[PDB]
């Protein structure tokens, strides 16, 4: 089997991407944030505290003839940005782009933090990291990809995120028309539950490539590119007037600037992020200070190849017995 679904930016900055997902019988379509940095499929629901719902579409398990309470199971998750959610669990039929999994754990939110409430466009998350990170207790649950894997023509999914445009998540096949050149594959460590890999270096603009190992995670659920402070300083030093602002929470730059590209290494291959992809616009409406798309990971504990980096590539998440990641230009 295969599946193919379009993923769409939630706003004009590509702050996140939403993909329609069919849950239950008859189908209830929710727009979920596909997150290769986490492993829970959770949704706004008829159980979510009413004051914490503000425009989201909700899953109502009582209206699904295939929903079943997963008795005794609870979940609770906290993300790297400080947001969180928790609740109980149903199993139900879940379909993405024509690919159907029966008995998928659908984590129904009883509580969500303010950042979720305030984002009316995101009806929940669909985790695509390794199932060892799934938070359901006392019986940990499998991701949608893990459940679908055996049925797929090939045990893979691909992320093809657009810059200020829709893109595609495919399951079970690699669309050879969606990229240019060849795909370069690189080793993955699953030790922390992430799609963790080691970039071979970077360049700023037209500068020379610096060969250096940068361990990090491929994370579709993180907006920006978070890298070591040395690398990030070298980038922003090429932008007149750019500075790190403690009051804003990262590097800002004059909105009048033209940003240089940023290149990252994948083995001997190179993925070029155009400068425009690194512009996240005014820090507040009407400001002439703009927020940068490359930020320091120093306070995170891990480097994160988020959407800024991934959207410059066609990315293969290879879930074979020994997982690997593939990157191609496009």
UniProtKB/Swiss-Prot annotation:
The active site is at 35, 199. GO terms for biological process: proteolysis. It is an enzyme of class 3 (hydrolase). Its EC number is 3.4.23.22. Disulfide bonds join 255-290. Residues 17-328 form the Peptidase A1 domain. The keyword Translocase does not apply. GO terms for molecular function: aspartic-type endopeptidase activity. The keyword Signal applies. Keywords: Aspartyl protease, Disulfide bond, Hydrolase, Protease, Signal, Zymogen. It catalyses: Hydrolysis of proteins with specificity similar to that of pepsin A, prefers hydrophobic residues at P1 and P1', but does not cleave 14-Ala-|-Leu-15 in the B chain of insulin or Z-Glu-Tyr. Clots milk. Belongs to the peptidase A1 family. This is Endothiapepsin. The chain holds residues 90 to 419 of 419 of the full protein.
């Amino acid at each position: 089997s295969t599946g193919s679904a379009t993923t769409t930016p939630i706003d004009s900055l590509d702050d996140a991407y939403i993909t329609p997902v069919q849950i239950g019988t008859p189908a209830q379509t929710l727009n979920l944030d596909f997150d290769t940095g986490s492993s829970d499929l959770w949704v706004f629901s008829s159980e979510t505290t009413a004051s914490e719902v503000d425009g989201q579409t909700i899953y109502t398990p009582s209206k699904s003839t295939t929903a079943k309470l997963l008795s005794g199971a609870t979940w609770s998750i906290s993300y790297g940005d400080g947001s969180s959610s928790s609740g109980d669990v149903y199993t139900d039929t879940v379909s993405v782009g024509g690919l159907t999994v029966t008995g998928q754990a659908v984590e129904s939110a009883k509580k969500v933090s303010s950042s979720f409430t305030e984002d009316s466009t995101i009806d929940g998350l669909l985790g695509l990291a390794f199932s060892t990170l799934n938070t359901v207790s006392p019986t940990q649950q499998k991701t949608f990809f893990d459940n679908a894997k055996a049925s797929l023509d090939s045990p893979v999914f691909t992320a093809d995120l657009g810059y200020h445009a829709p893109g595609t998540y495919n399951f079970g096949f690699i669309d050879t028309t969606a990229y240019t050149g060849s795909i370069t594959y690189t080793a993955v460590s699953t030790k922390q539950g992430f799609w963790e890999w080691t970039s071979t270096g970077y360049a700023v603009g037209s500068g020379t490539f610096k060969s250096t190992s940068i361990d990090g995670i491929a994370d579709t659920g993180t907006t920006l590119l978070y890298l070591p402070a040395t690398v990030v300083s070298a980038y922003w030093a090429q932008v007149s007037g750019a500075k790190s602002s403690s009051s804003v929470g990262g590097y800002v730059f004059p909105c009048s600037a033209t940003l240089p590209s940023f290149t990252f290494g994948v083995g001997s291959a190179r993925i070029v992020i155009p400068g425009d992809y690194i512009d996240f616009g005014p820090i507040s409406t009407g400001s002439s200070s703009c927020f940068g798309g490359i930020q320091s990971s120093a306070g995170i504990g891990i480097n994160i190849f988020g959407d800024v980096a991934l959207k410059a590539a066609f990315v293969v998440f290879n879930g074979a017995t020994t997982p690997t990641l593939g990157f191609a230009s496009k």
